[PDB]
Amino acid sequence: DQVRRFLRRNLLVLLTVSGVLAGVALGLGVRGAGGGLALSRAQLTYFAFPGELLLRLLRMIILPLVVCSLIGGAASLDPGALGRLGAWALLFFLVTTLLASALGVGLALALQPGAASNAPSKEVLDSFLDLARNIFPSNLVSAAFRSYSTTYEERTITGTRVKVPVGQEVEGMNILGLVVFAIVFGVALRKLGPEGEELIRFFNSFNEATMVLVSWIMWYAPVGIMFLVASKIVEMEDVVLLFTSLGKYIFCCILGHAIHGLIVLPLIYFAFTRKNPYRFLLGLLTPLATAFGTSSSSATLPLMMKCVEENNGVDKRISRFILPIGATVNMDGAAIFQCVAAVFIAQLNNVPLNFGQIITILVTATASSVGAAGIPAGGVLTLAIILEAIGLPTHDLSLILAVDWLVDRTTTVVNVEGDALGAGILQHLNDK
């Protein structure tokens, strides 16, 4: 009878895998019907309708999550603001997240997971200006559904081409401005007195309610995932190309994880408090295996911290302060996954990306970490944040969730490794 009880206790995973497999089977079958696809684009829309409903629900939830969780995380920054070691920890986490995300986007651009197959474009400096203008939105309410973009206008003065910008308010929600406003508002509330605690209690309750909505939406998800996969299979010809692109994206993400966690972090260890990091790596061989197997960052925290304390040596107080607060903040592997996934989605639709969009990707991937205390970072939710920030279709989110089961383990192991290395280097710095 325990077989039935196991299914009841793990209904979400079974339903999700059943939905993915049913979507693949349905797409293959309807592609095999007749000589080829002949249904009209109206029927394509009718077939992809449940996926559209799912994506609308996700965006509707993206807005309150961004406006609330960032405020809460910024206002709850006092454990690291009460000491110099906390400031060093926060700075190290931020710098490591930026460098990891840059490495991920660079490796994804270089390896080209997609592709394998005139409209004008913006300018690099004008894209930078658009990026900087979107940092501070002109209006708070108008930023909930509209963004800024430099639309270009062309004049033909008796044969002389003239190319002039306009810079109107292009429709489409900008999250980067909302993130910046939320962060600065959270800092302002932290600098405020006792009434700040009441306001942030308000915001935390709102964020928790929105999280409950996230849970219900993820409960609804499998049918929408099925229909999204089916519609993608129908619309995208050469399904073998799609499968091999998914495989190349998986290999790209694993390679990014490996290069980060085996070169960049040991380089940081060798730089700060110069000594060999391989010793600490061999010491902590246990917790990395537990993190790779269980694929849970919070569950491996006590065993990993006790193993760090027993093996080699640690002040224990520095570790006892860093590890609980660094486990759900660092998110190195989350940054790698989010950057590589955003690049892969942008390349699967043959959508070129400029410098402004890349810097936006890096900044939002970093800024989701400070709000990760209230949102489930490392999943497809932060990827949806990034996709809405840079303005790409999100019909490939289901396809990426189809491989999330197999590229999440290395994410957790590299996050645990990064936290451990940071704790070690800060302990050695504090020892002096």
Partner: protein, 97 residues
């Protein structure tokens, strides 16, 4: 042989020169869409419903009577309107034959 869109022209103080935007929001114009060619380059001309300045919460060019698009918009953070334009162009090209 599409008509030569004279209405796309703009008068500058006396001299008249042809001008056309790159990205204009969907809410700024209605349903009648015409294709015009200027010196061998195809563009889309339409009446402008955003004379006042905005329509349906979307900003529109001010003080213009006839908007004049390019066939495919720009990739500069044009959100999804550009993808929709891509689908409409591919289905129009498919249906042309």
């Amino acid at each position: 042989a599409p008509p030569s869109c004279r209405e796309c022209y703009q008068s500058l103080h006396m001299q008249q020169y042809f001008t056309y935007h790159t990205h204009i929001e969907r809410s700024c114009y209605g349903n009648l869409i015409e294709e015009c060619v200027e010196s061998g380059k195809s563009y889309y001309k339409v009446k402008n419903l955003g004379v006042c300045g905005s329509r349906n919460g979307a900003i529109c060019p001010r003080g213009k009577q006839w908007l004049c698009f390019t066939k495919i918009g720009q990739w500069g953070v044009n959100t999804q309107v550009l993808e929709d334009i891509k689908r409409e162009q591919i289905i129009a090209k498919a249906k042309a034959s």
